[PDB]
């Protein structure tokens, strides 16, 4: 309701705010922080949208088809995507992370290099991005000035010192073995899944992104309204174990269940604020 400000210094003035929403029906807490930059020297205004918050993984063994079949639902993807409309004159200047990456933990410090510039570092005062993603990759979805977005999808994973196993893993005897607790163990199918204790925390607790898009709009721009869609989603897979005769045999079905959680925020470039 105020839009808080700092400034650094007689060049710029950082109008900063935060916009949270808790999508209980999709198990997501979207946290969207924003920072307006007003470097009078440079000709354009910079908006840096930091998309924090947490998507719950929603790993779940969901039914029992007798004691020889059972299905597991697990998160094989997470996304966050920003996207301006086709007609609009604002442009996506910069974004972080800038490349795709494996590393367990991403981390970089964003600062403003007094030139309409905002660059990242991995080792002048500003805040820093970090997010952990064990057993996952981060893929930069094909960005342009209109649209940018990340998808942290499942990479591979060890299973009780065997493995590693991925979504496209296959053994003729045992099939796919991602969350197969035992191989030829006589028990209820539903009891023979891998405890979420023994896999990635992104599967249970879930993902918590810390990405940063930055948008530029010119002071001279004839229309200072600016709408943008911020879509968090969760792709989930279907993994069924079933007894064969002599042993167990699992199998994955890619991308059964999706959870597109779209919000759309308005940006007053003049009064330098943002709200859903």
């Amino acid at each position, epitope marked *: 309701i105020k839009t808080g400000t700092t400034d650094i210094g007689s060049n710029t003035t950082v109008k900063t705010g935060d916009l949270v929403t808790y999508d209980k029906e999709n198990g997501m807490l979207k946290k969207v922080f924003y920072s307006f930059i007003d470097d009078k020297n440079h000709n354009k205004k910079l908006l840096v949208i930091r998309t924090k918050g947490t998507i719950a993984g929603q790993y779940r063994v969901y*039914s029992e088809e007798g004691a020889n079949k059972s299905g597991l639902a697990w998160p094989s993807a997470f996304k966050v995507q920003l996207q301006l409309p086709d007609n609009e004159v604002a442009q996506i200047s910069d974004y972080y992370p800038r490349n795709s990456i494996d590393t367990k933990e991403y981390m970089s410090t964003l600062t403003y290099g007094f030139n309409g510039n905002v660059t990242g570092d991995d080792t002048s005062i500003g805040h820093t991005l970090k997010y952990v993603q064990p057993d996952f990759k981060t893929i930069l979805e094909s960005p342009t000035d209109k649209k940018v977005g990340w998808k942290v999808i499942f990479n591979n994973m060890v299973n009780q010192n065997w493995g590693p196993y991925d979504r496209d893993s296959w053994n003729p005897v045992y099939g796919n073995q991602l969350f197969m607790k035992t191989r030829n163990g006589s028990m209820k199918a539903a009891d023979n899944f891998l405890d*979420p204790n023994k896999a990635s925390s992104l599967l*249970s607790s879930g993902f918590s992104p810390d990405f940063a898009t930055v948008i530029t709009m010119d002071r001279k721009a004839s229309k200072q309204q600016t709408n943008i869609d911020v879509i968090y989603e969760r792709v989930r897979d279907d993994y069924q174990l079933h007894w064969t005769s002599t042993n167990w045999k699992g199998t994955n079905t890619k991308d059964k269940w999706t959870d597109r959680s779209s919000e759309r925020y308005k940006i007053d470039w003049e009064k330098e604020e943002m709200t859903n």
Partner: antibody
Amino acid sequence: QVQLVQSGAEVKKPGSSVKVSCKTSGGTFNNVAINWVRQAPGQGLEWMGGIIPGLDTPNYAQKFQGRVTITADKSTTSTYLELSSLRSDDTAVYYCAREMEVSGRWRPTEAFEIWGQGTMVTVSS
Amino acid sequence: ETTLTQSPGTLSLSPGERATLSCRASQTISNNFVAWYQQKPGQAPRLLIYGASTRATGIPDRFSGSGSGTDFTLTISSLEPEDFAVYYCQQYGSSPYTFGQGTKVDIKR
């Protein structure tokens, strides 16, 4: 004030099929499992099936042999319990019972926390 | 199935006295997941205890769960007028999610 409100009582000719509904009032809907439990007059309770709306994954009791078939619906925020080839011995109260919405649930269901009023199905020729 | 079987049949006691309902399983119910419901005439049942020992929201300390292996037991610390009803144990781990037959408590004259 999260709450369930089931359909009106009914009476069905034996051989026909019934389906009672159960709408979720207050509170969330999607990944919280709704079960159906049934009670004959002055009798024990009997689990029949459940459904996890979001996944739309039904969980059926195997004794019933798929006569029982359960579904969910977002527009109505409700579940349905259909039962085919009704008989004299089905005449019972039919409660829907939403599970307890616990933090880290990775199993189907767990502990039937809030129940509807029950629907009376009374199969008689 | 994993068939529970409660005891005793009826429980003829007066208020102030403690009543200990027992419930025993075919096989281990895991131990995760065993609930106790109280049903009064005409109404639906009412979740008292879950998991095994921890009690559902709003239930008074009077009601108390405990057990292990294949024997679980609900204890009413000090029976109160309203507590005289039927009591149903259940396991909700393995499908089919079996219910006990039911033990009734009964004001004693």
